[PDB]
Amino acid sequence: MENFQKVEKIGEGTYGVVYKARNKLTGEVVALKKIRLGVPSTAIREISLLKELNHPNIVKLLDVIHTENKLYLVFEFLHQDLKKFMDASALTGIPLPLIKSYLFQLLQGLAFCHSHRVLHRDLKPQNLLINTEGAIKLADFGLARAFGVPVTLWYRAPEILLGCKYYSTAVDIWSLGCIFAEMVTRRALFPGDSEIDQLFRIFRTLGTPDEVVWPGVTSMPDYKPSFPKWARQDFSKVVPPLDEDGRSLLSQMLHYDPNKRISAKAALAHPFFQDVTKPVPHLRL
Numbered sequence: 001m002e003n004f005q006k007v008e009k010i011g012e013g014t015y016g017v018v019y020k021a022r023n024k025l026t027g028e029v030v031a032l033k034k035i036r037l038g039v040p041s042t043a044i045r046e047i048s049l050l051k052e053l054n055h056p057n058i059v060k061l062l063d064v065i066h067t068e069n070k071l072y073l074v075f076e077f078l079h080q081d082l083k084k085f086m087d088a089s090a091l092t093g094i095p096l097p098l099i100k101s102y103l104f105q106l107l108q109g110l111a112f113c114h115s116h117r118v119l120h121r122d123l124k125p126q127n128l129l130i131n132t133e134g135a136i137k138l139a140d141f142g143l144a145r146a147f148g149v150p151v152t153l154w155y156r157a158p159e160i161l162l163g164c165k166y167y168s169t170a171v172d173i174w175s176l177g178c179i180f181a182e183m184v185t186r187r188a189l190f191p192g193d194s195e196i197d198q199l200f201r202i203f204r205t206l207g208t209p210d211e212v213v214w215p216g217v218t219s220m221p222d223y224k225p226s227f228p229k230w231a232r233q234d235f236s237k238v239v240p241p242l243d244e245d246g247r248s249l250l251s252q253m254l255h256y257d258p259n260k261r262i263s264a265k266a267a268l269a270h271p272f273f274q275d276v277t278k279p280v281p282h283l284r285l
């Protein structure tokens, strides 16, 4: 920490506080994360593995600093998050080709991390970071598991909400699916204020799941036979004015059954991405 000069606080939550900071002697400008507490050894090993994990759509973890029995993480700094960018574009909306770029790259990031069996688990607009060049990257990949972390529910896959202890990479596709739809419509897709309300907002839109669409669902830990039975709605109603290609890909990203939910790899090949390009955004910094 004495090697770093804090500039401003840019975030807070699970893992504590995040600062924009300058390395007092290199001059490099970084994002510094102080982890919230010595540090268990399994957490050190796992975070060390994450440092290896380099890809253009993943926020580079530059340095792990474990000292005075605290853990600091030093990340590359990007200048804006997707939430602020969505708020600033709320009057016009983000152009579809930039949405498509951002989705494509984000699926590239997941594909990569998933091929290394690394899971995000807590995707949200504040974890997705952009630059002036038209790139977008995922921040905090693998932190949940490295740290054994057990509040925004809005992007939570139904299998987590119904009490699956052993969930898969499919939980990140679900989240990214809810973010895709939010970019398109300019409203959060499932804005739950509690876990049951989150679940029930999902059921009211996609239909109450059952054994036919999701084998095994009724035996899940927090499944209750007393759940109300709502009928599924048309995506044409959910995400106007996304085209049929985009709606087809979204529904596959929002399959109830995690084994039927599209992989990031397969999603990259979806016809929605046939005319993808890489626009640059208008960022006001």
Ligand SMILES: C[C@@H](O)[C@@H](C)Oc1nc(Nc2ccc([S@](=N)(=O)C3CC3)cc2)ncc1Br
Binding pocket: 010, 011, 012, 018, 031, 059, 075, 076, 077, 078, 079, 080, 081, 082, 083, 084, 085, 126, 127, 128, 129, 139, 140
């Ligand atoms: C993912 C989340 O904890 C974050 C904190 O981490 C990072 N944040 C950033 N940069 C950054 C994040 C937010 C904003 S913002 N849209 O202006 C916010 C309203 C103030 C600007 C830059 N760069 C690497 C990391 Br890692």
